[PDB]
Design a protein around this ligand. Structure first.
Ligand SMILES: Nc1ncnc2c1ncn2[C@@H]1O[C@H](CSCC[C@H](N)C(=O)O)[C@@H](O)[C@H]1O
Ligand SMILES: [Zn+2]
Ligand SMILES: [Zn+2]
Ligand SMILES: [Zn+2]
Lengths: 52, 52, 431
């Protein structure tokens, strides 16, 4: 149930998650749930896209 | 921005680090057991999200 | 090296083989005055019988039209057909490729070694009037495009490279460019070509000076990486009184557009000399007459640190240090510590009290004016100092000016205070 809520929240915000911290700053997840799931979900980083 | 001869990135310099003294100082200052975490960080830095 | 992006760059726009015209009246040479007596070079056609190439009007030939930036036209000139001064018409561009590096977008690189003064590539686009240019500029600003694509062909006539053009639109600005744009006459039309300012080797990026008129647009930071970079994309100021010192440096001193206006308005308009816009020479009188207010913003602290790393003038550093003396916000000082202000202050000391371009009494006053905030700033570890080792410079200057005992005693107190602070760890490395 939490996965479907997370997917719907991401699709509301724009179907793209820029940063891991946005699971907390955008109120998408709670503190302990994020603390559990932070290192097991990842965002592919492309150096050509992020020059900064 | 200017990798050396036959090296993709500077991640090979991590093998010169003495992680044991760093873990000892972490345990002394902050009372954190992070000896395996330094190894996990080193392995992940050398190859981001390997196939385990 | 970086992967080729030539086809990917080509797909982003409609490729043109030649310049397109909004109407037949625009782009005509001599403001549309048809020179029926077209300028015919007196060169005799030099046909090499082996290769069948007409070598007339070459690079090292004495073709008058080539020197005067005019292309020979076949059937009208004595040089004959297929002469060596039909570079625009024959479209004999240099071989180039498209790639990506640093903070730049797509960029143009030389696929082969290119000689000095050699024609590289003809800048292509749509020839448009001023109103069409204004409309397209407003549309692109609404679209949020962060790239220039307009060049001034001549007065009232512009070239747009946004939707249609050539590979030349991918050339990036360099403050020390290896190529330059020039204006040439081909027939009754005007063209804009790009020529090599020096010898360029294979793989090197091809760049030219934009000399961009903003028309009131905001400055864009320049990330060319050249040592002589001014830090922002622009050109000549829109009027006098606009700058006396570089922005970061001027804003570091607390000066703004109004304070830079006021000095020139008070003297230049009242028969007193102020030179043109050039930051190579610092006008000490302006810096002395400037007003100083305490710093409470961290971006201003970063600009101060940049000014310390850039400016060599004694008087600008004096007034910046005085402004720091007025400054007492601890967060700005912590930011300066993060920026390693001690590192910059070491060089600022060295240039004035180790190198001697000034007088000993004035240098003594400077040293007394710069020891105070060093005594006053919050410090909690010698690792801050270790990023600068400014203590060594302090020992050197107290030893050099040992006759001036107040400086020595102040540096004694300063090193005594700094000696008691804590230290932070560095991971040992295998041996
Ligand atoms: N040295 C430089 N530093 C930062 N941006 C630059 C630059 N040279 C060019 N640019 C950027 O490129 C624009 C010109 S168009 C150059 C091609 C474009 N960057 C692309 O890859 O599609 C400028 O308006 C500016 O936004
Ligand atoms: Zn000729
Ligand atoms: Zn000719
Ligand atoms: Zn620059």
């Amino acid at each position: 149930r939490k996965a479907a809520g997370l997917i719907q929240s991401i699709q509301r915000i724009g179907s793209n998650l820029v940063n891991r911290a946005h699971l907390i700053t955008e109120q998408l997840t709670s503190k302990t749930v994020f603390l559990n799931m932070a290192s097991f979900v990842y965002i592919v980083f492309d150096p050509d896209v992020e020059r900064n | 921005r200017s990798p050396p001869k036959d090296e993709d990135d500077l991640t090979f310099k991590l093998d010169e680090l003495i992680l044991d003294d760093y873990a000892t100082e972490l345990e002394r200052k902050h009372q954190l057991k992070k000896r395996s975490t330094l190894q996990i960080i080193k392995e992940e830095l050398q190859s981001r999200y390997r196939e385990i | 090296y970086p992967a080729d992006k030539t086809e990917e760059a080509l797909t982003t726009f409609k490729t043109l083989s030649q310049n397109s015209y909004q109407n037949k009246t625009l782009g005509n040479a001599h403001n549309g005055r048809s020179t029926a007596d077209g300028m015919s070079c007196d060169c005799e056609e030099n046909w090499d019988t082996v290769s069948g190439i007409n070598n007339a009007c070459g690079e090292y030939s004495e073709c008058i039209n080539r020197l005067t930036s005019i292309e020979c036209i076949s059937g009208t000139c004595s040089c004959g057909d297929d002469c060596q001064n039909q570079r625009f018409q024959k479209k004999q561009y240099a071989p180039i490729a498209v790639f990506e590096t640093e903070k730049k977008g797509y960029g143009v690189r030389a696929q082969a070694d290119i000689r000095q003064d050699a024609f590289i590539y003809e800048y292509l686009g749509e020839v448009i009037d001023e109103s069409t240019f204004r409309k397209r500029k407003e549309n692109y600003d609404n679209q949020g495009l962060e790239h220039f694509y307009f060049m001034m062909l001549q007065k009232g006539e512009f070239i747009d490279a946004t939707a249609k053009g050539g590979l030349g639109r991918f050339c990036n600005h360099s403050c020390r460019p290896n190529a330059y744009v020039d204006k040439w006459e081909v027939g009754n039309k005007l063209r804009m070509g790009i020529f090599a300012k020096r010898e360029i080797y294979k793989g090197e990026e091809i760049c030219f000076d934009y000399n961009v008129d903003r028309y009131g647009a905001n400055p864009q930071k320049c990330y060319c990486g050249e040592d002589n970079c001014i830090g922002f994309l622009g050109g000549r100021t829109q009027t006098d009184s606009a700058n006396i010192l570089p922005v970061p440096i001027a804003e570091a001193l607390g000066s703004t557009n109004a304070q830079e206006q006021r000095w020139v308005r008070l003297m230049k308009e009242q028969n007193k000399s102020i030179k043109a816009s050039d930051y190579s020479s610092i006008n000490e009188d302006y810096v002395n007459s400037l007003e100083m207010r305490p710093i409470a913003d961290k971006d201003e602290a970063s600009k101060v640190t940049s000014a310390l790393l850039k400016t060599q003038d004694y008087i600008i550093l004096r007034k910046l240090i005085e402004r720091v003396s007025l400054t007492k916000d601890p967060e700005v000082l912590k930011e300066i510590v993060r920026l390693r202000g001690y590192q910059c202050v070491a060089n600022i000391l060295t240039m004035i009290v180790l190198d001697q371009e000034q007088q000993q009494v004035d240098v003594e006053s400077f040293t007394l004016s710069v020891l105070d905030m060093l005594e006053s700033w919050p410090n909690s570890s010698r690792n801050r100092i270790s990023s600068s080792q400014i203590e060594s410079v302090l020992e050197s200057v107290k030893t050099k000016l040992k006759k001036i005992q107040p400086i020595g005693k102040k540096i004694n107190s300063l090193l005594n205070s700094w000696s008691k602070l804590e230290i932070s760890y560095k991971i040992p490395k295998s041996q």
